Amino acid sequence: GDDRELAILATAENLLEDRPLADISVDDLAKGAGISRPTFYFYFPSKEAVLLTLLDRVVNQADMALQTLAENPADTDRENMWRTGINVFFETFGSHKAVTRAGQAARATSVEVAELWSTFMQKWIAYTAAVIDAERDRGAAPRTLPAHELATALNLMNERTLFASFAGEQPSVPEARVLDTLVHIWVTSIYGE
């Protein structure tokens, strides 16, 4: 039961490395998973649904990693603090490039994909803003822009920059340079006057 569902999800992730979801058929997915077509339709209503579940797993992986970090603060300077946090997303999404790509493309066509992305981006922004607020309260960061609006722009920067880097879009920051680039912009904008 969960065996064949997992195999469907694994097949989909493997195939999305090579082609977009549009050029992957339900037959392709069932064949890869060792099942028939109608047995596929037992587990998922559509190939779009498969991509939704893949994206849900990746987003929750990132979220759970960020929670783990928030419970286990590393003992470091504020630069390293933000770097370790940004790195959760760099590593988690960067380990699932094909899902990230296809998920971000689905936002324009799937309400459910858009909603998933929005839910988690709201959470991540809210947490960012709470950390900025804590830095301001302890006197380390100046009271400049509204923390939630600063957090929003920085999170959107990271989304667009990380995803362009992973896809080798032109233009993009090289993947080996993206974490230094983002961390600089976060630290200067959060702590600068």
Ligand X SMILES: CCCCNC(=O)N1CCC(C)CC1
Query: Where along the sequence are the contacts to ligand X (CB under 6 A)?
Result: 85-86, 89, 124, 127-128, 131, 155, 158-159, 162
Please report where in the chains the tokens 């799937």 appear, as a residue: 110
CA atoms within 13 A on the CB side of 121: 16
Residues near 94 by beta carbon (within 8 Å), at least 6 away in sequence: 162, 166, 175
CB burial string 139-166: b at 16+ within 10 A, e below = eebeeeeebeebbbebbeebbebbbbbb
Q: Which does 85 bind (CB under 5 to 8 A by kind): ligand X, a copy of itself, none?
A: ligand X
Identify which range of 23-31, 48-56, 90-98, 115-123 contacts a copy of itself by CB under 8 A: 115-123
Nearest residue to ligand X on Cβ basis: 85
Residue 160 and residue 86: Cα distance in Å, rounded?
13
Nearer to a copy of itself, 69 or 121 (CB): 121
Tokens of 62: 């990132």
Near a copy of itself by CB under 8 A: residue from 53, 61, 87, 161: 161
CB of 32 to ligand X, least distance (A): 29
Interacting residues with a copy of itself (CB under 8 A):
105, 108, 118, 121-122, 125, 144-146, 149-150, 152-157, 159-161, 164, 169-174, 177-178, 180-182, 184-185, 188-189, 192
